[PDB]
Design a protein around this ligand. Sequence first.
Ligand code: HEC
Length: 124
Amino acid sequence: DVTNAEKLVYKYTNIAHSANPMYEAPSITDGKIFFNRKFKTPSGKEAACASCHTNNPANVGKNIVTGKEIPPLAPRVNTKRFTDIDKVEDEFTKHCNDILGADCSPSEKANFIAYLLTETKPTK
Ligand code: HEC
């Protein structure tokens, strides 16, 4: 739920700030840029988190590889997101690995989840 997401924001912020002293607090802007930024897959095709999750994490997404729908990521809309916070940290590390080839950095996770807490409205 939102509570659990908000607590992982603190956790990742504090990790990031230890590693990277100039990072002090989450940036919702940078979290949004990261979610929408086009990166280059090995093939040269560009993709973004938004390719599957849409440009609004409050909406239902669709996996471009399988065509399968994906529940919304924004915990205010889909309150099951971040229900088992331990499980979630492992899943998200695995998921970063799968999508990007390596884990997301602690500041990317803090910024991203912070951004998610701001998206409470599905695009209509
Ligand atoms: C399709 C190829 C995807 C792209 C590109 C990204 N994500 Fe994804 N995401 C996708 C699936 C099939 C799932 C699992 C099904 C489900 O309902 O959970 C996810 C899940 C997430 C989650 C939930 C937690 C988790 O399972 O790790 C998060 C927070 C998430 N995705 C974030 C995310 C980010 C930040 C991405 C860019 C780096 C990204 N996803 C890309 C499908 C796809």
